[PDB]
Every structure is written in C-alpha cells, then in structure tokens.
Amino acid sequence: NVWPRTFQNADGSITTIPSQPKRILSTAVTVTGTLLAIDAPVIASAATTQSTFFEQWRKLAELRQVKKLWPAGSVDLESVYVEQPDLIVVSMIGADSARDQIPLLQAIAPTILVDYSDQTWQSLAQQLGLATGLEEQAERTIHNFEQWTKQVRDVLDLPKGRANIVSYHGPGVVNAVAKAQSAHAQLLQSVGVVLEEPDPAWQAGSIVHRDFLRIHYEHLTQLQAETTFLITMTDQQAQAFLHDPILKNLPSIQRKQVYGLGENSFRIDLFSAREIINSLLRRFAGEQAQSLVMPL
Ligand SMILES: C[C@H]1OC(c2cccc(O)c2O)=N[C@@H]1C(=O)NCCCN(CCCNC(=O)c1cccc(O)c1O)C(=O)[C@H]1N=C(c2cccc(O)c2O)O[C@@H]1C
Ligand SMILES: [Fe+3]
C-alpha cells in the first residue's frame, strides 16, 4: 500500500494524498453514506439543505461520532480547520456540491472531487477505497452485496415487462425520471428489473444531469413501463401518483403496479440499497422473502 498516491478528480485535476487518510471530512452528505459503507474513518460530514443526515445511516453516523457540519450550500471553513482533517471529499454535482470551494478547502487538507451521479454506489465505494487505502474493505463489501443480489435476483417474481423510476412532484412542476447510469437504475437492474430510459429529448432547460432526467410534468404521461417505482416514497405515499388524474392512462397505473421505492430511497448507498432490496423481497418473493431479508 503505497503513499503518497495520486487521485484522479472528476474535473480532470489530480490530488496527491501524502499519507493514508485517518481523519476524513465529507462536504457532501450523499458521499457520506458510502464512506460509512466501507468503514472509512469519516469524522465529520456536511448535511442536507435541511440540516439532516440521511435516515438510512443517521444512527450509524451518530454511533461512530461523525460530527454534523453545515447544511449544504454554506461551507464553514472555521469548522473544517478545527476538525483538522487529512482528506476532504467534495461532490461534482448536486445540492451538496462544494466544487467551487475546492481552492479554499485544498489550502486546509488534500481535497478530492467525485461524481456520484453516474455511477453505482459500488463504483463510488471503489473510487473512495483507492483514495483511502481501503481497497480490501471496499472489495469485500461490494463482493458480499453482489452475492446477495444474486440470491435475491433468483427468488423475485417481478411483474412482466419493464419499470421506470420516478421522482414525483405533481402537476405544474418539473419532475424527474431515472437514467440508465444512475445508482437507482443499476441497483434495480442487478436484481433483474428491466429499466425504461426517459427520452433524452425531454430534458427541461439547460442543466445537464446524469442521474435523473429533469422533465416537464406532461412528459410523465408518455412513460411506457408496466411498473413504476417512486423514490423517497412509501407505497401509501405513492397513492398520490396512482390517483393523479392526468396520469390515469399510464400502463403502470392501469395495471396498479406503482410502488414506493421506500422512505429512504432518495440517494443510493449500501444502507438504502439494502432497504430497497428488502422491500422488493417482501413484495415480489414468496416465503423465500424472509430467508434473504438483510438485518439493517
Ligand atoms: C432529502 C433532501 O436532500 C436533498 C439533496 C441532498 C443532496 C444533494 C441533492 O441534490 C439533494 O436534492 N433532496 C431533498 C430536498 O432538499 N427536498 C426538497 C426539494 C429539493 N429539490 C426540488 C425537487 C426536485 N428534485 C428532484 O426531484 C430530484 C430528483 C433526483 C435527484 C435529485 O438530486 C433531485 O433533487 C431539488 O431539486 C434539490 N436538489 C437541487 C440541486 C441543485 C443543483 C444540482 C442538482 O443536481 C440538484 O439536485 O437543489 C435542491 C436542494
Ligand atoms: Fe437534488
């Protein structure tokens, strides 16, 4: 395990990490879940704009004494200095991105930049494993999860056809649909779901996103999949989608195959991925469900 080592950042820049990181500070709440997943020594993390940690890993973060820092958008440099980190992690795109603050952060400690929007949680874990010297941990974690998804894939009786994954906000608002490279789409694909891709031409406005295509509301009526999964929703919450009169003729609504992906499914990390797969076992597997549900 060689140190120093060079890390390739998502913007084409490089960062030399002089020594194995032991005090990692995350500036992106999305990335923190994956740092926890590989048991990296993350000692502090910024939060959502609402000053929260994601619920799938909050209790674990508290147990490991991960200090909650600023809500996304407002980097507190004093807090970074006081934590005395030896690696600072930044995301490329998303509400939790501190990309423009990199020069200020790099003055404090080696700062790296990753894009979680177009890779699986496993790929992000591998990338972070290489930055932290935790390749053994990451590889083991990924391998174990993949052994599990194999087993699950073999017992699910999924609806015929394909599924889409939607972030729903109702009429008169820009909504969003998961793209093939998203952590969400790839997670479902891994247990045998066949994914519908939103038409790239439906992009709303000028901002490019690799995770979910942002679209005018009306385009939701054009989705063809027989099944719809809603992020950040329970099944009960998904009822609002099902009863939206504008969407009454959607194949997934006609077949009453609209499901919540789960309360904690907004971002995908090992912890929310487990919850999501557990939900699929409960709904689509028989008395084979329980033999495979993972303890949280
Ligand atoms: C539990 C909460 O933590 C965050 C969160 C945490 C960390 C990073 C994020 O991005 C986060 O959203 N999300 C929840 C929250 O604040 N809910 C209140 C509504 C926020 N909303 C409006 C609703 C439409 N968005 C989607 O349907 C959607 C779908 C799929 C993926 C997404 O990221 C989506 O937001 C947003 O658009 C928010 N994201 C941008 C943003 C800005 C610049 C570049 C981007 O890529 C952006 O997303 O700006 C807002 C703050
Ligand atoms: Fe967002």
Residue in this structure with the two tokens 């809603």, named with its chain if needed: 230
Together in a domain, 119 and 108:
no
Quote the CA–CA distance of 173 and 169 in Å, as a whole number: 6
How are beta strands 258-262 and 227-231 bridged, if at all? parallel
CB count in 10 Å sphere of residue 52: 12
CB count in 10 Å sphere of residue 186: 19
- 95 C-alpha to ligand 1 centroid (Å): 6
Please answer whether residues 121 and 273 qualify as being in contact, where contact means their C-beta atoms are separated by less than 8 angstroms: yes
Nearest CA residue ID for atom 48, ligand 1 = 94
Together in a domain, 137 and 271:
yes
Residue 75 exposed, middle or buried by CB count within 10 Å (0-12, 13-18, 19+): middle
Please give the full DSSP string across the chain, using - where no structure is assigned. Answer: --SSEEEE-TTS-EEEE-S--SSEEES-HHHHHHHHHTT--EEEEEE-TTS---TTTHHHHHHTT-EEEEETT---HHHHHHH--SEEEEESSSTT--GGGHHHHHTTS-EEEE--TTS-HHHHHHHHHHHHT-HHHHHHHHHHHHHHHHHHHTT--PPSS-EEEEE---TTS-EEEE-TTSHHHHHHHHTTPPBPPPPGGGB-SS---SSEEEE-GGGGGG---SEEEEET--HHHHHHHHT-GGGTT-HHHHTT-EEEEETT-SS--HHHHHHHHHHHHHHH--TTSTTTPPP-
Pocket lining for ligand 1, CB < 6 angstroms: 29-30, 48-49, 72, 93-96, 167, 169, 176, 209, 211-212, 266
Q: Of 250, 167, 173, 227, whose CA–CA distance to 204 is shortest?
A: 173
Together in a domain, 187 and 244:
yes
CA dist 201 to 94, 164, 208, 215, Å? 21, 17, 12, 9
Quote the CA–CA distance of 79 and 81 in Å, as a whole number: 5
Please answer whether residues 278 and 149 qualify as being in contact, where contact means their C-beta atoms are separated by less than 8 angstroms: no
Burial 134-168 (b: 16+ CB within 10 A, else e): beebbeebbeebeebbeebbebbebeeebbbbbbb
Radius of gyration of the chain from its Cα atoms, rounded to whole angstroms: 20
Quote the CA–CA distance of 177 and 234 in Å, as a whole number: 17
Please answer whether residues 28 and 71 qualify as being in contact, where contact means their C-beta atoms are separated by less than 8 angstroms: no
The CATH number that applies at residue 147 is 3.40.50.1980
Q: Which strands sit side by side in the sheet containing 24-26, from one edge to the other?
A: 67-71, 42-47, 24-26, 87-91, 111-114
Together in a domain, 93 and 145:
no
Please give the full DSSP string across 207-252, using - where no structure is assigned. Answer: ---SSEEEE-GGGGGG---SEEEEET--HHHHHHHHT-GGGTT-HH
Sign of CA dihedral 283, 287, 289, 290: positive
CA dist 291 to 153, 192, 205, 214, Å? 13, 19, 46, 38
Quote the CA–CA distance of 144 and 146 in Å, as a whole number: 5
- 94 C-alpha to ligand 1 centroid (Å): 7
Resolution for the entry shown, Å: 1.5
Mutate-to-test residue for ligand 1 from 55, 56, 266, highest number of ligand atoms within 8 A of CB: 266
Mutate-to-test residue for ligand 1 from 49, 166, 167, 237, highest number of ligand atoms within 8 A of CB: 49
Q: Give residues whose Cβ lies within 5 Å of ion ligand 2.
A: 95
- 20 C-alpha to ligand 2 centroid (Å): 31
- 96 C-alpha to ligand 1 centroid (Å): 9
- 74 C-alpha to ligand 2 centroid (Å): 16
Smallest-distance ligand from the CA of 211: 1
Together in a domain, 75 and 150:
no
Overall domain count for the chain: 2
Q: Of 164, 191, 162, whose CA–CA distance to 175 is shortest?
A: 164
> What backbone phi and psi angles, to 5 degrees, belong to 177?
-135, 135
Its domain, for residue 119, covers: 115-296
Smallest-distance ligand from the CA of 214: 1
Together in a domain, 243 and 152:
yes
Last residue of a domain, one of 114, 138, 169: 114
- 1 C-alpha to ligand 1 centroid (Å): 37
Together in a domain, 72 and 53:
yes
Quote the CA–CA distance of 87 and 41 in Å, as a whole number: 10
- 53 C-alpha to ligand 2 centroid (Å): 15
Together in a domain, 133 and 247:
yes
Which atom from ligand 1 is nearest to the alpha carbon of 209? 46
Quote the CA–CA distance of 212 and 183 in Å, as a whole number: 10
Quote the CA–CA distance of 180 and 171 in Å, as a whole number: 25
Nearest CA residue ID for atom 42, ligand 1 = 95
Q: Of 113, 119, 97, 96, whose CA–CA distance to 48 is shortest?
A: 96
Quote the CA–CA distance of 98 and 92 in Å, as a whole number: 8
